[model samples]
Target chain A: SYTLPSLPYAYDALEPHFDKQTMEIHHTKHHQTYVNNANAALESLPEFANLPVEELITKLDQLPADKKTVLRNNAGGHANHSLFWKGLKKGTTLQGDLKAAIERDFGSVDNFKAEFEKAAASRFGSGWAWLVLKGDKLAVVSTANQDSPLMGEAISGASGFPIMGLDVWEHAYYLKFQNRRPDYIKEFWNVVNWDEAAARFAAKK
Target chain B: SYTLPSLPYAYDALEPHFDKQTMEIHHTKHHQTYVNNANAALESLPEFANLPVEELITKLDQLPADKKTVLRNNAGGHANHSLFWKGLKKGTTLQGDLKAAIERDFGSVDNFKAEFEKAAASRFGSGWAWLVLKGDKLAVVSTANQDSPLMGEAISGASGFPIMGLDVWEHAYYLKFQNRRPDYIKEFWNVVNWDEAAARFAAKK
Candidate 1:
């Protein structure tokens, strides 16, 4: 079975902004459980068990009807966390083309951040705020729960590869932010791993 | 101008679970922008200029037809985010009546999470999965976009206070989770601040 990935840093490492206890539970208990469940759900179905997690998620409807929902849930869980774990890093800065793109698209990095955060903060229910790479351009978009840019029809008007994502689910920050998601979001900037984002941008087609 | 709130925790605090970079951008750039936009839209309306941000949002229909859309978008942004910010906390455990209730209504916390995650993961588009307080009973519900438990009478099934919310928006997890929204939903369980949730339950009545 695929295992939960180790965080790039330590729990409590994102400090004051995010608490240690939250990190520990989020990774060990929450993410790991999904990894286990995904593997378990797929274990009886050899066709899906052998496929890469990402591939399985991209083709959710192709799974056996009896198992489609489970695959959709567990496979989606596996794929989402896989990216989430890797997409983040401790202290990375944005520069070069990505920075220039930010300025060009939203006037400034701050403006882009504002737009993204507003989208995230105001999502109303469980969802994500995204910074995406659509072709060569950068755009800001949001999607509701577990849905990603890859699920084109699932999102209202969004389609693209996401370069950055923020989980606004209460579970992501509730323990630490506690009814202060804006405060939690405010702290999100300090820990942005711009390096990863820049690489994502550079790699985007 | 309602200035951006500083990070409650240091940049690296949420590390492991959340990176400093993600947190930083989420806050200063994202949350601040929402606050500014919401304030801007409110300022443009003489009738609503003096009302608290919360009041304007809860009664979006009251605004002039010309400003209704802007108020809905911006005020909804403000109100939703304001609640989102307050709905989370760190180091808190889910216990007391909330725990007993989960056991009673959903069998176990694990079961409740599985159901909730499924609800979040399966929502067709931009929306939210909510745990609402309805006349002393708790129900899980989901809503799309800025439409809250209050908006779109069609969605809420009548009035209810949102005790907990999960943003199913793509921007919430697209960059990292990609198309695997279920994974994101599963990951949320680890970081839920049950203490805060219990408090919300207590206050609802």
Candidate 2:
């Protein structure tokens, strides 16, 4: 079974912004559930277990119908949550050419945050907001649910490496924000670890 | 300019789940932009301004291509956020025989939540998770982007009333959850306001 990943900071580290209890339940209970379910799905089909989750997800049409939903949900959950955990940190700052790129593409860091936060907050339903590197350009994109930039048929202007992402699923914040999702979104910036994001961007390039 | 809706509860009413700063920014900055852009898009096109935002979104392909993106983005943003806001409430409980329906269909409330959350978390791109009333029964369904159960032709599911819906777009959570979408999904339950969902079910019937 896949194990829960470690948070880059303490549960309370994002406090006054993101409550610690919410983060704890989110990571330990929810993400762990997806990991467990993903392992169970794979375990039942030994032949597919060796393939990476991304590979399994991308080729969903090929899987037997009986296993399709299981693999799709569990594998997707595993892959999405796994990437989500790795993309965060605390007290890190944006640096290097990425800063320059942000300024060039979005005018300034604050503007970028403004635009990005709007995208995340305005997404009508459950989904993600992403900072992506598309063909040497940095762009902000949003995908709903476990769908990521990594899934789906290749399309021009679609492919990219995800440098950073946020989950706006109600489960992510309803505990604290209730129906007030915009409130949850506002708290997201304080916990962002730009250093980790920079590393992901550099690695992708 | 369309004015921001006042929060039904005090900014700090949500306390630990949502911070005041998050609420203020989400309402003033994020939601306000969608409202403004939506009005801007409509105002610029005198021929279309009188129509409801929903009507325009449902007929997007009919519009000129140059205007399609704007309508899809801004008008879609308007309709979606409006529905999201109205769908939620505080301290209300589920009613209207949905409990028995939940038992008949998904076996239990927990089971329904699991299934719904799974669907919400696993949609491949920007989309929504729905508790829809279809025919005589209730079902869990999902749609991508601004499409909803009401958008029958654009989405995979049959037409129905949306009793409960969740937005899983990343912009909804990136600032707060980073990559931990499942965590975000888990927290959604706390703010579900099942009373509103039950009323929606009755209205549809």
Candidate 3:
């Protein structure tokens, strides 16, 4: 059975950008439920019980048709939330190989930010906006619900190795930003863990 | 251009069950954006500019491919939010033909409530739960993002004449309910406008 992974930083670590109350609840309640539900769904299938969260989501089609929906959502939720927690931090600068790649692909850092923000703000429902490595190129993509880019475009309609992701689901921002998603998107830059993002960028197969 | 509709009751009318701040923002911010975007998308397409919101969403396939995505979301948003506001009331009892239909279709009003709550609670991402008239029967259905049953199963994967609907979007309850979506679903029963539902049920084709 999967247990919720602890956040890389304290619940209150992100401060004014992402509030203490919201972070605490998002991690302990929202992410915890995903872990619990994912575990329960996997319990019936011993073959899938020991699969890593990453493999569980990436190979969703291998699951039984009857069990696919629950695993797609809850397993997807577990994986996405785990990556989401690791992707957030306070004050990290963009630099090195990933920085050069962003400049080459997106023209400039500000342009990349604009494209990322547009994807984040334009996502019509509960989803995530991502900066991902798609075939050695950085691309901005969005996915609905708990879907991950790792699920492949065939499943999630967006395929890549997510270098970094921002949860655009209202639970991620509504307590502080309310309906102002652009503000939340803007503030997210303040807490991005660029070093972690770079490490993910470097490690992708 | 379509304007935002005034709520039949004041923003604070639903009080503690829905909350004044959430209602005010949902109507003025979230729903208003839908109205605004729907108008913007319709601007270049004169034929669609004057169509009723209901007609616009119900006939989404007729829209130009470029315009369909935008209008389907924003126009669908306009229609759903309009119905949702009308479906909410502080206190209203189950009675009349609609009440009888509920008992017939779902065994009892309590069973219907349970089914409706299940639909609302289980909608994984942003969407709505509906007590809808589906070809001479009452059915509980859910749709993703800004989709509505009016768009038919071909498009929304759910088709019905919505007799009553609840906004299960996190933006609908995140301020007060946070990650406890079931609690939010539970509290929503306190505000359902059964009279309006009766009217919708009686009028459905």
Candidate 4:
């Protein structure tokens, strides 16, 4: 059975970028519901019950059809939120091999930010925008609802080791950003954990 | 050109159950963006510009491949929000032919409400749950994102004359309800304009 992961920092750690009220509810309520549902969905599949959400989503095709949708949604939610929380912080600077790679893939760091913001802003409904390492190259992609880039192109329309993820779900920012999703996307830069993202990128490569 | 439709009631009309701030932003910013994007998408296909969003969505197959997604999303958003505003009010009782029809199809009014709430609750992401007349029977269905019941079964997976719709998008209730979507669905019953829904059923039948 899976339990909700605790936030890396206090609820208000992200501050002006991500509000405390939204952070508390998002972690305690939203993420906990996914954790609970994912565990329930995995009960019948004992062999898969111990798998982490990251692995569970990638191996969803092996699950029974009756339980697939629930696991895909809840487990995917769990996985995505886990990464999203880890990928947020304040006052982190972009540098290192990850910076070079971003420049290589998207022409420049600013270009990479623009592309990521474009992916985040243009996702029409609830979903996520990701900076991911697909094979040897970096790419920007968005997936609907809780679907993750790790779920593969066949399911989530993209596949990679997610280096950074931004939750574009309305619940993620509606309290502070309201209908200004682009503003939320812009503010995300102020709090993005570039160091964490750099570590993921370096480890994956 | 498509334009945002004014809310049938003032922003505070559905207060307590649905807050004024959420309603104001939902209409002015969210719905207005859809109208603007729908108009922009239709600009390239002048022939379809005159069609109402309800008609436009039904005719989406005729649109150019490059334009279909934008139109389906924006036009669907336009149509769904249009019906949503008209379907909300305070103190309207469920009676007349609509009540009898609900009881006839669902066994009782309570059962009908349960089914509708089930559909609304089970929808995992941004979307709507609808009570619609399919042939002569009322059916409860949910569609992903902005897809509408009017978009036809081939597109939205369920199509009919939508008598009532409940928005399950986090944006629709995140301010007041947060992750308590079930609570939002419950409160919707209080603000739902049963009289208006009854009129739609009567006219469509």
Candidate 5:
């Protein structure tokens, strides 16, 4: 079984900022469904069955073409939710080399924040917004469906190695925020885990 | 100003099959947003301001290339939701020429229903499934994120003039169906307005 990672805090730990019920449903119901489906997809392929999801998602080319989409969707779902869970935590400050690079590249954290919000909210459908390291450069990008920035595109690319990702899927916020995705975007600022983001930037940079 | 079309039935009329709240929000909130955005896009393009929604969507290339996406998203949204409203009505029959076409093109009406459901459900994100007439042929197709069949090749040549359409955006059913899209799809049959579909078939054929 591909197990779900435990949330860093109790589901309600980010409440008022993140809202408890949405977190519980998102982690238990939604993330579990992804893990279940990803495991089911690997069941018939013994060569890849025991690999960690992080490895399996990158090794997408090894799967039979028919099963590849299943893995891309389910495995991508598993990996994306994993990152999303890590990216969020209660009130972490941004002060580090990653913060400096963002300022240098984007003029200020406020400019970077505005661009990130646009990347997530202006995504017309289900997807994720990524803060990424393209070698030494920093870029913000978005991807559709359960697609990861790490997966070389089937038909296109502007992708880079992801450092922090925000799940913009309706299932991520529709339960609490409804059509006010802007409101959900506003609240996410309250829980961004910047130290972890800084570490990812240091490693990926 | 582009006005919101009066939904053919009162907001509550589709109830018990399509719940009143979803229909109300979908119309007043979601569909109205499309109308609002479409009109906003047309604001600077005087040549297109007076044209109908149907004309504006299909003739998108005439607008500035930069504004083409705005019209494609909003104008396509307007046209699609307009057809979606008419595609649904309670207890309508699936007989006459449209039924005969379904039988001929798809082998049987039951098969046609199954295929349309598959087309709608299989769509990964916000989009529409369409029953369309090209010359005299009837076909089922889908488009992603406010895309209409009216656009030129996101693919080539399989597109046609739409006779019926279904909105598969999360907002369409998330209020009631939650993650059970299959359940909402099952109920869609009860209110499918086949007579309007038949008329569209007649004119196109």
Candidate 6:
């Protein structure tokens, strides 16, 4: 019963910075595929259907080997895309505890941005950059593929929560930006839902 | 003193399957950068200046944090692309020990190809799919970013010596294939140098 969440804004809402076609395809096609695949994987293991998407990905390793990879990929896709949709807004400003957290952890808002962009662009391939509240600290983390910080360690790196993330996969930008990920990254700042980020930080903290 | 190796064949050699434009830029622009960066990292650490490219990535952990990431990425990039250049030929036939080994390990050449293509296309981001020798058996392994099979374990996975590898980075094929990695992958088989692969197997074996 996993569903692709309706975007908080229209496909063309984040125009100039984020184009319409990329948004349309990314949301309807890419996100839809994840939701469908996730549900299909769950259908095969009804006992786990009640576990919830986050918990499903977190404990994905416990599934049978025949089903583990499929569920990990699809379920992680479902969970990651779900958050991705919610974390973006056309125009956002950071304030409240989240602003304080970014400043306290990264020295200044600009420093936070530089570090986040470094993480996003430094990703050599398909992946994500995240702002998570790890323990009591607001830490930035990145993950490859449909991987989630809640989904256990990536053997290559650690994972975590407060769950706010950005998609760095080429499909996230190639339609409009092509190989210029740094430029796309520059534009991402304009659309981020910092108010939503603040709420997530409050809840997680 | 690291250097970008010339393509053993002309940039146009693997035409129809691999285009001249892709090969030309892939080698000169993408690969040359890795060589220059690796050399720069070495210049900053004179003690390791004489280390071979493969050895550079393997011992990368020994460098200062400021220098380690740059060296690991650039050194790994240099090594991987260096091998990538040597591992292609327009027309090649797999036979003798290499053919037999492919049959023995993967049931048949077609199965081996299916699995290899799955590995290549399944990689969610920038990375490579390798057929490597781990002791007596052959295995398909992959690594993220500018990483190589000759290096220590990636934060995500282990490494081993070669058979051959396919670079799945978007920059490797996005110029020609766009979002359809499978199309680029199907064309890859036409250019793989089975003769060189056999040599790798013989040496590693």
Q: Which structure among the candidates has the greatest DockQ? A: 3
- CA lDDT of each candidate? 0.69, 0.71, 0.90, 0.90, 0.83, 0.81
Residues B1-205 of candidate 5 have per-residue lDDT tens digits of: 5788898888888888888987877788778988998888778888888988877777877789888888888888888888888888987888887788899999998898899999998887678888888768888888888888877555222378988888888778877877778898898888889889888888873
Q: Write the per-residue lDDT of candidate 6 for residues A37-126, one digit (tens) a residue.
A: 778877878778888888887777678888888777788888888888888887678887778878999999999899889888887657
Tens digits of per-residue lDDT, candidate 1, B89-151, equal: 556678888889878878888888877877787665466788887777677777656667755
| Clashing residue pair totals per candidate (backbone < 3 A) | 77, 32, 0, 0, 0, 6
Q: Any idea what lDDT model 2 has?
A: 0.71
Return the candidate ranking by lDDT, descending: 4, 3, 5, 6, 2, 1
Select the stronger candidate by DockQ from 4 and 5.
Answer: 4
lDDT of 6 by residue, B71-129 (tens): 77888888889888888897789899988988999999999999999888777658899
| DockQ per candidate | 0.08, 0.16, 0.91, 0.88, 0.51, 0.33
Model 4 has a DockQ score of 0.88
Chain B TM-score, all predictions listed: 0.84, 0.81, 0.97, 0.98, 0.95, 0.95
lDDT of 3 by residue, B101-120 (tens): 99999999999989988888
| Segments of candidate 3 deviating more than 4 angstroms | none
Docking quality of model 1: it rates as: incorrect
lDDT of 4 by residue, A1-205 (tens): 8878888999989888789998998999989999999888888888998787788888989999999999999999998898888988898899989898888999999899899989999998999999999999999999999999898999999989999999989988888989989888988899999999999988993
In the range A127-158, model 1's lDDT, one tens digit per residue, is 67889887677888886556667656552346
lDDT of 3 at B18: 82
- Per-residue CA lDDT of model 2 for A1-205, tens digit only, reads 4667787678887777777887887788777777787788677777777787757777777777787776666676677777776666566677897798899988899999998888898665566788888878888887655566766534112346778888887677765775577777777777676877888777883
The residue pairs that clash in candidate 4, if any, are none
lDDT of 2 at A33: 75
Please give the TM-score that candidate 6 achieves against the real structure.
Answer: 0.81
DockQ of 3: 0.91
Which model is ahead, 2 or 5, in terms of DockQ? Answer: 5
